[PDB]
Design a protein around this ligand. Structure first.
Ligand SMILES: *[C@@H]1O[C@H](CO)[C@@H](O)[C@H](O[C@@H]2O[C@@H](C)[C@@H](O)[C@@H](O)[C@@H]2O)[C@H]1NC(C)=O
Ligand SMILES: *[C@@H]1O[C@H](CO)[C@@H](O)[C@H](O[C@@H]2O[C@@H](C)[C@@H](O)[C@@H](O)[C@@H]2O)[C@H]1NC(C)=O
Ligand SMILES: *[C@@H]1O[C@H](CO)[C@@H](O)[C@H](O[C@@H]2O[C@@H](C)[C@@H](O)[C@@H](O)[C@@H]2O)[C@H]1NC(C)=O
Ligand SMILES: *[C@@H]1O[C@H](CO)[C@@H](O)[C@H](O[C@@H]2O[C@@H](C)[C@@H](O)[C@@H](O)[C@@H]2O)[C@H]1NC(C)=O
Ligand SMILES: CC(=O)N[C@@H]1[C@@H](O)[C@H](O)[C@@H](CO)O[C@H]1O
Ligand SMILES: CC(=O)N[C@@H]1[C@@H](O)[C@H](O)[C@@H](CO)O[C@H]1O
Ligand SMILES: CC(=O)N[C@@H]1[C@@H](O)[C@H](O)[C@@H](CO)O[C@H]1O
Ligand SMILES: CC(=O)N[C@@H]1[C@@H](O)[C@H](O)[C@@H](CO)O[C@H]1O
Ligand SMILES: [Ca+2]
Ligand SMILES: [Ca+2]
Ligand SMILES: [Ca+2]
Ligand SMILES: [Ca+2]
Lengths: 219, 219, 219, 219
């Protein structure tokens, strides 16, 4: 009756993809999420989806903290929810990607968390833990490990300017990125540099992907 | 001991209309509501009542989010509470209406929700889900399906101006309305256009109804 | 283990006056209170105490909502806590009073609540329910029944000016008062009109009492 | 499954130092802490650590209320968390100290709390309860007993100026201190007066200690 994530939902006998209530250890009010019950046996809690450019992702700090969009479409679950999920157990991250020629690729990370040891994860900038790459998309996240989350209105990156402003996104920017999945929905090849839905190791710095899904499952 | 709504209250053996504590899945602190234990077998959770013009309904965003008035009289339960109720199960909506000549009518909607898949229902504007009309008042809500909630100080409608300002209410306005049950208590026929307690399919756009009650029950 | 008030604390076998954790129905985090386990068999939850003038009571809205002072001395528990207590069951109010000549008196009210049916008790001004006087101090509260709570920075009274500013207190003021137990600690007879710790039916409008305690118990 | 502190964690069979979830009586959402399972049998909940000067401690009121830094390194758990822990039972305080010549000392206090009887511990300034010194570092805290917590942006001390501003820290300042463990990480002997990580009874007023840990355990 109180699953902590989509894997508890699956193991309780819910096999269909869709929206479910989950109740993280330190977020006992709980909230709804999209559960992927198909990928590698299922039990994945979605926290990011791009598929059509219907939702504005060029949002400030409060929106990235609290979440935006709809669970059934393009959304960002919110860093306060991603923190509550990833601190309650050891999670892996799965990233699904699709181009406009219906090509697909994925990146799996054996460890993933946000603000794991932060007393105030919001003040500390929800810093990224990520390690142990495998898959077909190539690694575009390991260089972001240890970076705080940066938005157009709150700069915690390693750049003289604001990486989020410059690359029209919100991410764990260093100086600045190898991945930008919260970037502008520019729809494939673009002249502007690295400011779309980029996964540089698969499609480079001038190709805005059609589809992205970021999702977590206990190791 | 922890009913989720007025139907749980009724099925627990409370048969009297009145104020009860309910505890929605994602609002575990709970809150008090007015329960209608008579209509079509009872178990209806009230979220809106007009009966006398004693309460100001021309209120801003925060008041429509948090609720106002009194459970025993004219009130609005608050969109944060209506969201918590309608996302925890599939609800139907019942609307009771009365004119100043003691005529009555009702509208039943087989599905009703507010912000059903919204990650942040407040930021997303508590959008309306409504379908499957039946009853005697005629349908004045189906055209509002998919619209965000608009107040005098927060415009999310499909109009060049603010529908809430123009029609002195707060509603899931398109451009602008077929219903306005949070409109001014103008007391029957009025010269001003559509800015009273209107249900256009029953009494048209220049008749402010005497009584309205909006209430929900699990399908 | 989760008493809802000081009467649950007493009936659980705690017989000593002092500070205890209580957990009201709609405030499940709970909070600490002073329990009077002596008066008329005990089980009284204190929400107001004056005894020495050590604490400033001439405070604004936020302080009267959230509480101030110390449970072991002069304090105001806070209208958000008094609301959570008095809406969860039917309470009686006991008021103990002492003058500077060690005279004592009390007022008992068979029913007492704050914001009982208010959807947003804070927006609605935590209105007073009180009835059924008995005791030795005389009735100085029944005329306040139905009034909202007024502070120096938030006027909801029936006066052309601010009763809280004028009588240097915070109360369910009409125009303006018969009681002012949150008034200035002026220490007995005073020239200034009605701006001390007044209980007019016992000591009139120019006598600031030495001691007051307001406390509640389920009927 | 719901330990209230690190002693419950230890007695449940967790013997390793590290980060654990705890759930104080009036903070049922819970939070993570560093548990010291070694000192005097173990079961100590850490709330302060200095070890390297990597974290800025010269922070304002909100940061001292909410916490900052990382549980695995330098941090301050936050006065709202320290209040929730120390009001739920009778705690003792242990302070470990180390100089830059690898000398160590400790101070044990048989009673310790923050805002113990405060209705609003934040408004009341999270006042210190401390008594019953023993150990090797000497007593540098008893003179602070009864003082409110003071930061650069919120002065509650007994000084004509702001003790936190003057001594570049945050503490239960009187006029001004015998201890300053949230002071500047100045690294040993310094010319500036008393504005480093000072424990005056061990190393005087011009020696910024290398290491400090403040931690609590039920008496
Ligand atoms: C990519 O997959 C989608 C969804 O499964 C397909 O609809 C696309 O097929 C193309 O578009 C459809 C509507 C139809 O015209 C078909 O003949 C096309 O091949 C598919 N391919 C591309 C290039 O988008
Ligand atoms: C509508 O119903 C109400 C409530 O049941 C009635 O009180 C009204 O009756 C009218 O008003 C009462 C006070 C009395 O004068 C009676 O003779 C009237 O018919 C009733 N009718 C209307 C038109 O409001
Ligand atoms: C009122 O009661 C208090 C507390 O029980 C007493 O202390 C007072 O007694 C008076 O003050 C004490 C200190 C002592 O001087 C005694 O002889 C006095 O009678 C008591 N009376 C008054 C008038 O305050
Ligand atoms: C203090 O303790 C630390 C940690 O246990 C030691 O590393 C220090 O030893 C000194 O530094 C190391 C790196 C090595 O050079 C050794 O030979 C030194 O004695 C130790 N001493 C001091 C003075 O910091
Ligand atoms: C999108 C992005 O961060 N791109 C480049 C990075 O590849 C490059 O190595 C660096 C050199 O300074 O400049 C960054 O802006
Ligand atoms: C109250 C309301 O929305 N009324 C009218 C609507 O019936 C009409 O079809 C439309 C034409 O533009 O103009 C709206 O303002
Ligand atoms: C303290 C207080 O409210 N006193 C008086 C009240 O007794 C009096 O009847 C009234 C007449 O207008 O004026 C009020 O101010
Ligand atoms: C750091 C600190 O508080 N030091 C001194 C204190 O030792 C001294 O007794 C006092 C005299 O006024 O002045 C304080 O500032
Ligand atoms: Ca920068
Ligand atoms: Ca508009
Ligand atoms: Ca007034
Ligand atoms: Ca000062």
């Amino acid at each position: 009756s109180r699953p902590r994530d989509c894997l508890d939902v699956l193991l309780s006998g819910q096999q269909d993809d869709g929206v479910y209530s989950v109740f993280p250890t330190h977020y006992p009010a709980g909230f709804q999420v999209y559960c992927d019950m198909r990928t590698d046996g299922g039990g994945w809690t979605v926290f990011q989806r791009r598929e059509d450019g219907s939702v504005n992702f060029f949002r400030g700090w409060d929106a990235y903290r609290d979440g935006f969009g709809r669970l059934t479409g393009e959304h960002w679950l919110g860093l306060k929810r991603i923190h509550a999920l990833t601190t309650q157990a050891a999670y892996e991250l799965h990233v699904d990607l699709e181009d406009f020629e219906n090509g697909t690729a994925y990146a799996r990370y054996g460890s993933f968390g946000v603000g794991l040891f932060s007393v105030d994860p919001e003040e500390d900038g929800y810093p990224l833990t990520v390690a142990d790459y495998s898959g077909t998309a190539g690694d575009s996240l390991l260089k972001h490990s240890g970076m705080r989350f940066t938005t157009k209105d709150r700069d915690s990156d390693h750049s003289e300017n604001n990486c989020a402003a410059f690359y029209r996104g919100a991410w764990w920017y260093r100086n600045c990125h190898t991945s930008n999945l919260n970037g502008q929905y520019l729809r494939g090849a673009h002249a502007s540099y690295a400011d779309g839905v980029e996964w540089s190791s698969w499609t480079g710095w001038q190709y805005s992907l059609k589809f992205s899904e970021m999702k977590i499952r206990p190791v």
